[PDB]
mmCIF file of C-alpha atoms and ligand atoms in Angstrom:
data_model
loop_
_atom_site.group_PDB
_atom_site.id
_atom_site.type_symbol
_atom_site.label_atom_id
_atom_site.label_comp_id
_atom_site.label_asym_id
_atom_site.label_seq_id
_atom_site.Cartn_x
_atom_site.Cartn_y
_atom_site.Cartn_z
ATOM 1 C CA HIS B 1088 76.136 113.389 91.466
ATOM 2 C CA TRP B 1089 72.413 114.151 91.605
ATOM 3 C CA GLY B 1090 69.959 111.295 91.944
ATOM 4 C CA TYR B 1091 66.883 110.138 93.850
ATOM 5 C CA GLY B 1092 68.507 108.920 97.072
ATOM 6 C CA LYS B 1093 68.480 110.210 100.641
ATOM 7 C CA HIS B 1094 71.702 112.195 100.165
ATOM 8 C CA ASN B 1095 71.465 113.291 96.529
ATOM 9 C CA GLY B 1096 67.710 113.402 95.836
ATOM 10 C CA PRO B 1097 65.111 116.166 95.255
ATOM 11 C CA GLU B 1098 65.651 117.911 98.608
ATOM 12 C CA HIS B 1099 69.334 118.434 97.728
ATOM 13 C CA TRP B 1100 68.983 119.635 94.120
ATOM 14 C CA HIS B 1101 68.704 123.345 94.930
ATOM 15 C CA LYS B 1102 72.340 123.451 96.011
ATOM 16 C CA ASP B 1103 73.611 122.798 92.522
ATOM 17 C CA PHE B 1104 70.524 124.222 90.787
ATOM 18 C CA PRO B 1105 69.085 127.144 92.771
ATOM 19 C CA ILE B 1106 66.145 127.422 90.338
ATOM 20 C CA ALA B 1107 64.856 124.383 92.297
ATOM 21 C CA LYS B 1108 63.303 127.001 94.603
ATOM 22 C CA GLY B 1109 62.050 129.110 91.701
ATOM 23 C CA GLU B 1110 58.595 130.408 90.850
ATOM 24 C CA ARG B 1111 57.705 127.881 88.096
ATOM 25 C CA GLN B 1112 58.893 124.440 89.385
ATOM 26 C CA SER B 1113 57.316 121.105 88.440
ATOM 27 C CA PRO B 1114 55.637 118.831 89.166
ATOM 28 C CA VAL B 1115 52.701 120.208 91.144
ATOM 29 C CA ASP B 1116 49.528 118.872 92.696
ATOM 30 C CA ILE B 1117 46.648 119.488 90.274
ATOM 31 C CA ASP B 1118 43.550 120.560 92.082
ATOM 32 C CA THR B 1119 40.896 119.444 89.564
ATOM 33 C CA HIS B 1120 38.279 121.750 91.048
ATOM 34 C CA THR B 1121 40.250 124.986 90.991
ATOM 35 C CA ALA B 1122 41.693 124.304 87.550
ATOM 36 C CA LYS B 1123 40.275 127.034 85.391
ATOM 37 C CA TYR B 1124 38.545 126.130 82.139
ATOM 38 C CA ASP B 1125 40.049 128.405 79.486
ATOM 39 C CA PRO B 1126 37.891 128.933 76.381
ATOM 40 C CA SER B 1127 40.819 130.502 74.496
ATOM 41 C CA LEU B 1128 42.735 127.189 74.439
ATOM 42 C CA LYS B 1129 42.804 125.951 70.837
ATOM 43 C CA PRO B 1130 42.125 122.258 69.981
ATOM 44 C CA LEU B 1131 45.134 120.067 70.984
ATOM 45 C CA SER B 1132 46.705 118.263 68.061
ATOM 46 C CA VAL B 1133 48.931 115.194 68.583
ATOM 47 C CA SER B 1134 50.192 114.078 65.188
ATOM 48 C CA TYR B 1135 52.354 110.998 65.729
ATOM 49 C CA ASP B 1136 51.691 109.047 62.503
ATOM 50 C CA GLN B 1137 55.177 109.650 61.063
ATOM 51 C CA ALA B 1138 57.078 109.199 64.365
ATOM 52 C CA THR B 1139 60.455 107.461 64.000
ATOM 53 C CA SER B 1140 61.813 105.906 67.190
ATOM 54 C CA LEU B 1141 65.528 105.139 67.124
ATOM 55 C CA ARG B 1142 66.967 103.801 70.372
ATOM 56 C CA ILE B 1143 66.167 103.014 73.984
ATOM 57 C CA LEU B 1144 68.692 103.639 76.725
ATOM 58 C CA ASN B 1145 69.183 103.477 80.482
ATOM 59 C CA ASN B 1146 70.842 106.774 81.533
ATOM 60 C CA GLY B 1147 71.209 105.892 85.237
ATOM 61 C CA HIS B 1148 68.114 107.922 86.218
ATOM 62 C CA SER B 1149 65.400 106.407 83.998
ATOM 63 C CA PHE B 1150 65.098 104.913 80.589
ATOM 64 C CA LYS B 1151 64.263 106.892 77.543
ATOM 65 C CA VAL B 1152 63.204 106.189 73.962
ATOM 66 C CA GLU B 1153 64.882 108.634 71.516
ATOM 67 C CA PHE B 1154 63.142 109.672 68.295
ATOM 68 C CA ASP B 1155 64.504 111.093 65.065
ATOM 69 C CA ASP B 1156 63.472 114.696 65.465
ATOM 70 C CA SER B 1157 65.454 115.963 62.471
ATOM 71 C CA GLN B 1158 62.294 116.284 60.385
ATOM 72 C CA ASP B 1159 58.747 117.479 60.614
ATOM 73 C CA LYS B 1160 57.360 114.282 62.201
ATOM 74 C CA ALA B 1161 55.590 113.634 65.497
ATOM 75 C CA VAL B 1162 54.396 117.084 66.393
ATOM 76 C CA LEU B 1163 52.265 118.599 69.059
ATOM 77 C CA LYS B 1164 50.422 121.813 68.370
ATOM 78 C CA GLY B 1165 47.340 123.748 69.528
ATOM 79 C CA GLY B 1166 46.117 123.712 73.111
ATOM 80 C CA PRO B 1167 48.045 126.464 74.983
ATOM 81 C CA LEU B 1168 50.908 126.249 72.521
ATOM 82 C CA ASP B 1169 52.118 128.850 70.073
ATOM 83 C CA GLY B 1170 53.604 127.276 66.976
ATOM 84 C CA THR B 1171 54.808 123.675 66.574
ATOM 85 C CA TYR B 1172 56.611 121.376 69.035
ATOM 86 C CA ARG B 1173 58.465 118.278 67.821
ATOM 87 C CA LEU B 1174 58.724 114.991 69.781
ATOM 88 C CA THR B 1175 62.266 114.146 70.764
ATOM 89 C CA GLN B 1176 61.997 111.425 73.441
ATOM 90 C CA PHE B 1177 59.723 109.836 76.000
ATOM 91 C CA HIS B 1178 60.571 108.399 79.404
ATOM 92 C CA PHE B 1179 58.842 107.347 82.593
ATOM 93 C CA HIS B 1180 59.006 107.865 86.334
ATOM 94 C CA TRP B 1181 57.767 105.146 88.676
ATOM 95 C CA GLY B 1182 57.613 103.841 92.215
ATOM 96 C CA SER B 1183 58.910 100.967 94.357
ATOM 97 C CA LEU B 1184 55.188 100.105 94.953
ATOM 98 C CA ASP B 1185 51.944 100.768 93.004
ATOM 99 C CA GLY B 1186 50.805 103.490 95.439
ATOM 100 C CA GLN B 1187 53.486 106.016 94.311
ATOM 101 C CA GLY B 1188 55.637 106.848 91.279
ATOM 102 C CA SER B 1189 53.904 109.761 89.496
ATOM 103 C CA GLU B 1190 55.405 113.261 89.621
ATOM 104 C CA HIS B 1191 52.189 115.201 89.132
ATOM 105 C CA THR B 1192 49.420 114.371 91.548
ATOM 106 C CA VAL B 1193 45.685 114.787 91.063
ATOM 107 C CA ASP B 1194 43.803 116.004 94.131
ATOM 108 C CA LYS B 1195 46.775 114.520 96.048
ATOM 109 C CA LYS B 1196 46.415 111.101 94.272
ATOM 110 C CA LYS B 1197 49.699 109.485 93.280
ATOM 111 C CA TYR B 1198 49.668 107.154 90.278
ATOM 112 C CA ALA B 1199 52.030 104.176 89.907
ATOM 113 C CA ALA B 1200 54.006 105.878 87.110
ATOM 114 C CA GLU B 1201 54.024 108.849 84.777
ATOM 115 C CA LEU B 1202 54.936 108.974 81.080
ATOM 116 C CA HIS B 1203 56.575 112.173 79.737
ATOM 117 C CA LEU B 1204 56.572 112.748 75.978
ATOM 118 C CA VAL B 1205 59.057 115.611 75.507
ATOM 119 C CA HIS B 1206 58.693 118.034 72.575
ATOM 120 C CA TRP B 1207 60.698 121.126 71.609
ATOM 121 C CA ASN B 1208 59.539 124.343 70.022
ATOM 122 C CA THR B 1209 60.669 124.238 66.348
ATOM 123 C CA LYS B 1210 61.572 127.963 66.605
ATOM 124 C CA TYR B 1211 64.740 126.841 68.450
ATOM 125 C CA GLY B 1212 65.988 124.202 66.061
ATOM 126 C CA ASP B 1213 66.948 121.525 68.577
ATOM 127 C CA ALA B 1214 65.971 120.268 72.050
ATOM 128 C CA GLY B 1215 69.083 121.533 73.916
ATOM 129 C CA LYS B 1216 68.681 125.125 72.691
ATOM 130 C CA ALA B 1217 64.947 124.893 73.362
ATOM 131 C CA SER B 1218 65.522 123.910 76.962
ATOM 132 C CA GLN B 1219 67.260 127.318 77.573
ATOM 133 C CA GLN B 1220 64.133 129.217 76.675
ATOM 134 C CA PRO B 1221 60.944 129.880 78.704
ATOM 135 C CA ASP B 1222 58.768 128.639 75.848
ATOM 136 C CA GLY B 1223 61.209 125.967 74.752
ATOM 137 C CA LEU B 1224 59.558 122.637 75.570
ATOM 138 C CA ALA B 1225 56.093 121.109 75.859
ATOM 139 C CA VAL B 1226 55.773 117.880 77.868
ATOM 140 C CA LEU B 1227 52.683 115.728 77.441
ATOM 141 C CA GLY B 1228 52.269 113.898 80.757
ATOM 142 C CA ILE B 1229 50.202 110.752 81.083
ATOM 143 C CA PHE B 1230 49.437 108.919 84.313
ATOM 144 C CA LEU B 1231 49.752 105.120 84.588
ATOM 145 C CA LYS B 1232 47.406 103.232 86.874
ATOM 146 C CA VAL B 1233 47.769 99.534 87.521
ATOM 147 C CA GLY B 1234 44.924 97.364 86.219
ATOM 148 C CA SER B 1235 44.495 95.930 82.714
ATOM 149 C CA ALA B 1236 47.605 95.841 80.500
ATOM 150 C CA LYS B 1237 48.411 98.518 77.905
ATOM 151 C CA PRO B 1238 49.216 96.408 74.795
ATOM 152 C CA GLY B 1239 51.025 99.346 73.170
ATOM 153 C CA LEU B 1240 53.466 99.456 76.082
ATOM 154 C CA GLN B 1241 54.516 95.843 75.723
ATOM 155 C CA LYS B 1242 57.277 96.449 73.088
ATOM 156 C CA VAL B 1243 58.942 98.741 75.635
ATOM 157 C CA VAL B 1244 58.551 96.353 78.594
ATOM 158 C CA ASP B 1245 59.922 93.418 76.653
ATOM 159 C CA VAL B 1246 63.273 95.068 75.838
ATOM 160 C CA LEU B 1247 63.997 96.384 79.311
ATOM 161 C CA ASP B 1248 65.950 93.230 80.226
ATOM 162 C CA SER B 1249 68.459 94.304 77.526
ATOM 163 C CA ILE B 1250 69.124 97.707 79.159
ATOM 164 C CA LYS B 1251 69.230 96.779 82.847
ATOM 165 C CA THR B 1252 72.134 98.957 83.892
ATOM 166 C CA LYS B 1253 73.354 102.504 83.323
ATOM 167 C CA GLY B 1254 74.924 103.020 79.874
ATOM 168 C CA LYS B 1255 73.163 100.122 78.164
ATOM 169 C CA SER B 1256 71.130 100.908 75.064
ATOM 170 C CA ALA B 1257 69.586 99.085 72.156
ATOM 171 C CA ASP B 1258 68.166 99.939 68.725
ATOM 172 C CA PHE B 1259 64.444 100.531 69.114
ATOM 173 C CA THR B 1260 62.725 101.223 65.757
ATOM 174 C CA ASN B 1261 59.073 101.330 64.710
ATOM 175 C CA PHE B 1262 57.743 102.001 68.182
ATOM 176 C CA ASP B 1263 54.409 103.782 67.811
ATOM 177 C CA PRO B 1264 53.801 106.274 70.675
ATOM 178 C CA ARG B 1265 50.137 106.468 69.667
ATOM 179 C CA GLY B 1266 49.841 103.149 71.548
ATOM 180 C CA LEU B 1267 50.565 104.902 74.887
ATOM 181 C CA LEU B 1268 47.713 107.421 74.650
ATOM 182 C CA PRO B 1269 44.390 107.208 76.530
ATOM 183 C CA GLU B 1270 41.051 107.722 74.718
ATOM 184 C CA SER B 1271 40.519 111.305 75.861
ATOM 185 C CA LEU B 1272 42.805 114.281 75.101
ATOM 186 C CA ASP B 1273 41.164 116.363 77.864
ATOM 187 C CA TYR B 1274 44.042 117.994 79.754
ATOM 188 C CA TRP B 1275 45.274 120.434 82.325
ATOM 189 C CA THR B 1276 48.049 122.870 81.440
ATOM 190 C CA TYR B 1277 50.337 125.102 83.470
ATOM 191 C CA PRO B 1278 53.801 126.659 83.080
ATOM 192 C CA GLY B 1279 56.649 124.846 84.739
ATOM 193 C CA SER B 1280 60.027 123.220 84.607
ATOM 194 C CA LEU B 1281 62.092 120.172 83.946
ATOM 195 C CA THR B 1282 61.568 117.735 86.817
ATOM 196 C CA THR B 1283 65.232 116.749 86.884
ATOM 197 C CA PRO B 1284 68.424 118.836 87.061
ATOM 198 C CA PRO B 1285 68.990 121.416 85.682
ATOM 199 C CA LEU B 1286 65.316 122.120 86.517
ATOM 200 C CA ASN B 1287 65.035 124.793 83.773
ATOM 201 C CA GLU B 1288 61.752 126.673 83.784
ATOM 202 C CA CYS B 1289 61.227 125.975 80.088
ATOM 203 C CA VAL B 1290 58.206 123.617 80.023
ATOM 204 C CA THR B 1291 54.574 124.113 79.075
ATOM 205 C CA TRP B 1292 53.051 121.111 80.868
ATOM 206 C CA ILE B 1293 50.120 119.353 79.247
ATOM 207 C CA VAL B 1294 48.802 116.667 81.666
ATOM 208 C CA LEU B 1295 46.082 114.410 80.399
ATOM 209 C CA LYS B 1296 43.092 113.820 82.665
ATOM 210 C CA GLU B 1297 42.609 110.145 81.726
ATOM 211 C CA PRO B 1298 45.249 107.691 82.919
ATOM 212 C CA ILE B 1299 46.303 104.737 80.894
ATOM 213 C CA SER B 1300 45.938 101.309 82.514
ATOM 214 C CA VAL B 1301 49.058 99.157 82.657
ATOM 215 C CA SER B 1302 49.369 95.755 84.236
ATOM 216 C CA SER B 1303 51.242 94.902 87.428
ATOM 217 C CA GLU B 1304 53.501 92.707 85.237
ATOM 218 C CA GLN B 1305 54.345 95.682 83.039
ATOM 219 C CA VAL B 1306 55.244 97.967 85.955
ATOM 220 C CA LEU B 1307 57.203 95.144 87.679
ATOM 221 C CA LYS B 1308 59.483 95.141 84.609
ATOM 222 C CA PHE B 1309 60.282 98.807 85.141
ATOM 223 C CA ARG B 1310 61.285 97.985 88.714
ATOM 224 C CA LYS B 1311 63.889 95.427 87.586
ATOM 225 C CA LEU B 1312 66.076 98.189 86.083
ATOM 226 C CA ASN B 1313 69.130 99.444 87.955
ATOM 227 C CA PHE B 1314 70.398 102.960 88.556
ATOM 228 C CA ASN B 1315 73.985 101.629 88.666
ATOM 229 C CA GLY B 1316 76.304 100.566 85.888
ATOM 230 C CA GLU B 1317 77.262 96.934 85.417
ATOM 231 C CA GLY B 1318 79.938 95.968 87.986
ATOM 232 C CA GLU B 1319 78.938 98.696 90.399
ATOM 233 C CA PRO B 1320 76.933 98.192 93.642
ATOM 234 C CA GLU B 1321 73.313 97.250 92.894
ATOM 235 C CA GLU B 1322 70.700 99.927 93.366
ATOM 236 C CA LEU B 1323 67.246 99.157 91.908
ATOM 237 C CA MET B 1324 65.809 101.887 89.702
ATOM 238 C CA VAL B 1325 62.657 102.688 91.664
ATOM 239 C CA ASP B 1326 61.159 105.899 93.031
ATOM 240 C CA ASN B 1327 62.735 108.134 90.349
ATOM 241 C CA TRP B 1328 60.116 110.862 90.857
ATOM 242 C CA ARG B 1329 60.330 114.428 92.135
ATOM 243 C CA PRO B 1330 57.551 115.287 94.622
ATOM 244 C CA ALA B 1331 55.038 118.119 94.090
ATOM 245 C CA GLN B 1332 56.494 121.608 94.302
ATOM 246 C CA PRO B 1333 54.694 124.819 95.432
ATOM 247 C CA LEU B 1334 52.317 126.301 92.811
ATOM 248 C CA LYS B 1335 53.261 129.872 93.877
ATOM 249 C CA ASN B 1336 51.561 132.473 91.670
ATOM 250 C CA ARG B 1337 50.568 130.110 88.859
ATOM 251 C CA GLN B 1338 47.183 129.034 87.532
ATOM 252 C CA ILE B 1339 46.399 125.636 86.148
ATOM 253 C CA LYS B 1340 44.004 125.707 83.198
ATOM 254 C CA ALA B 1341 41.663 122.973 82.029
ATOM 255 C CA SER B 1342 40.750 122.225 78.384
ATOM 256 C CA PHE B 1343 37.319 120.963 79.457
ATOM 257 C CA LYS B 1344 34.129 121.770 81.402
HETATM 258 N N1 LIG W 84 61.002 114.907 83.587
HETATM 259 S S1 LIG W 84 60.802 115.901 82.257
HETATM 260 O O1 LIG W 84 60.480 117.210 82.843
HETATM 261 O O2 LIG W 84 59.817 115.400 81.255
HETATM 262 C C1 LIG W 84 62.294 116.012 81.335
HETATM 263 C C2 LIG W 84 62.306 116.909 80.205
HETATM 264 F F1 LIG W 84 61.230 117.619 79.728
HETATM 265 C C3 LIG W 84 63.457 116.979 79.449
HETATM 266 F F2 LIG W 84 63.472 117.789 78.391
HETATM 267 C C4 LIG W 84 64.590 116.316 79.823
HETATM 268 C C5 LIG W 84 64.590 115.543 80.977
HETATM 269 F F3 LIG W 84 65.776 114.929 81.336
HETATM 270 C C6 LIG W 84 63.443 115.332 81.787
HETATM 271 N N2 LIG W 84 63.564 114.418 82.927
HETATM 272 C C7 LIG W 84 64.312 113.145 82.823
HETATM 273 C C8 LIG W 84 63.618 112.335 83.879
HETATM 274 C C9 LIG W 84 64.149 110.980 84.059
HETATM 275 C C10 LIG W 84 65.621 110.622 84.135
HETATM 276 C C11 LIG W 84 66.395 110.708 82.805
HETATM 277 C C12 LIG W 84 65.602 110.416 81.468
HETATM 278 C C13 LIG W 84 65.347 111.795 80.801
HETATM 279 C C14 LIG W 84 64.206 112.575 81.399
HETATM 280 ZN ZN1 LIG W 85 60.033 113.210 83.195
#
């Protein structure tokens, strides 16, 4: 099936998902100097105080933390967004070395990892339905650079040994996603897509300017995960990122300057 390898990775996806060569594909290189400040962007509101994490799982492509999105908790609103978007999961993409791993790039810079907090437009009632619509999802993307540790990430890192292989999961309650946010909410925004199959062009990307710092020990724990299931041939879960795609006719806006 699809994956991140030589024979099934990003260059191959368009065969099963022709939208791979579409007009709004993600990620992209963000040129910080041609990003257009947009005064009509409203203040960005990240309201995570009532977030309810449920479970963490290894799906064979990454790991994800699932939230209870059945109520009006953990919402993103404002910025470029119309209406209210509810948090449903977060996940990461990372590299086999610190010099790569992010999907978005900033003036060509690759970060060691990228965090995606995935929200769905409450007009659509759930995340699956939302993903079929052009305005269906908003993804808050945060870069991870290697340096000092992120204490708020440690709960995640410390359970990863329990979900090493595809199809493992564990209960994962009371994880506070506020602990993964940098100080600044300055951001870039552009219209795009899922970065994995089916590559739907349903995402309003919101990419924060300020990375978070994580430690080498934290990122090393990501790299001990496996794409395979237990009892199958070992393949380390590393380099699960799609490279930058053409911007085409789109404009990237900035919330600042
Ligand atoms: N990359 S993304 O663009 O934020 C994203 C979404 F917005 C989403 F709605 C659903 C998605 F599957 C993804 N990508 C995967 C990426 C990693 C392997 C599997 C874990 C789930 C997330
Ligand atoms: Zn992602």
